[PDB]
């Protein structure tokens, strides 16, 4: 995939340190190899990206240059070898060593993001159980859900409608992975992509992402019906 592509990381020029914290937290916890990497917007060279990678418990940074030849983006670590995209650039350097400083090294494991859920239509950062129930009540359908942040640290909640009743599943951010009960996923984004395909609680799958727009394009101006922490289906 493009797991490795992190784009603009955090507060403007705090991206070098964020790139290091992310690579450090990942490489130490998972036990990833030297060569583990990710790409992001440059914090010094406008429009250029930066290749941050792990090597000997340190995190080294490389500049990815971005130029236009015939109004066509071209990317490169060195002008003797230019690519039509960052995928090509990355995939090349995964196979043949890149030279940074005065050491030669190939790229290895793509380091993903833990927070790609923050840009999803079903994710609500500030949302009370009662607030999400009120929203979930407004929707008549089943398999219509929303994930929200809980007050207790490194925790989220899947609030959903199942068999005409509103139940709640707990998820925990265990460092670089998430844990719904004894089951494990890379992230929420991947967890919900699984529970979109497979049932999460009983016969119900995660089909309809509810936000403010979804209440307009579906929901009822009237909450009250019938409507504890529920246990999901294993694995």
Author numbering: 547 to 773, 782 to 789
Q: Can you provide the manuscript's text about this entry?
A:
Among families of proteins involved in signal transduction, phospholipase C (PLC) enzymes that generate second messengers from phosphatidylinositol 4,5-bisphosphate (PIP2) incorporate a number of different protein modules. PLCγ enzymes (PLCγ1 and PLCγ2), for example, contain eight domains, four of which are unique to this PLC family (Bunney and Katan, 2011; Suh et al., 2008). The PLCγ ‘specific array’ of domains (γSA), comprising a “split” PH (spPH) domain flanking two tandem SH2 domains and an SH3 domain, is inserted between the two halves (X and Y) of the TIM-barrel catalytic domain (Bunney and Katan, 2011). We demonstrate that among four domains present in the γSA, the cSH2 domain and its C-terminal linker provide a focus for most interdomain interactions both within the γSA and between the γSA and the PLC-core.
To analyze the structural and functional implications of Y783 phosphorylation and the potential for intramolecular binding to cSH2, we obtained the crystal structure of a construct incorporating nSH2-cSH2Y771F,Y775F (545–790) following phosphorylation on Y783. The structure of the tandem protein revealed an intramolecular interaction between the cSH2 canonical pY-peptide binding site and residues 781GFpYVEANPM790. Residues 774 to 780 are not visible in the electron density map suggesting that this part of the linker remains disordered. The structure shows that the cSH2 domain makes an essentially canonical binding interaction with the extended linker in which the pY783 side chain makes multiple interactions with three arginine (R675, 694, and 696) side chains in the conserved pY-binding pocket. The side chains of residues pY+1 (V784) and pY+3 (A786) are directed into shallower, hydrophobic pockets (formed by cSH2 residues F706, L726, L746, and Y747). The side chains of V784, A786, and P788 all make van der Waals contacts with the cSH2 domain, burying ∼620 Å2 of solvent accessible surface. Although the structure of the cSH2 domain is not affected upon pY783 binding, a further, more detailed comparison of the crystal structure of the phosphorylated nSH2-cSH2 protein with the nonphospho (apo) construct in the same crystal form shows general similarity with some subtle differences in angle and distance between the domains (not shown). However, the second binding phase is highly suppressed due to occupancy in cis of the canonical pY-binding site on the cSH2 by the pY783-linker region. The cSH2, in contrast, makes contacts with the PLC-core and recognizes an intramolecular pY motif rather than a receptor site. It also seems that a relatively small change in the tandem cSH2-nSH2—induced upon pY783 binding to cSH2—is allosterically relayed to the nSH2 domain reducing the affinity for FGFR1 but with no corresponding allosteric effect on PLC activity.
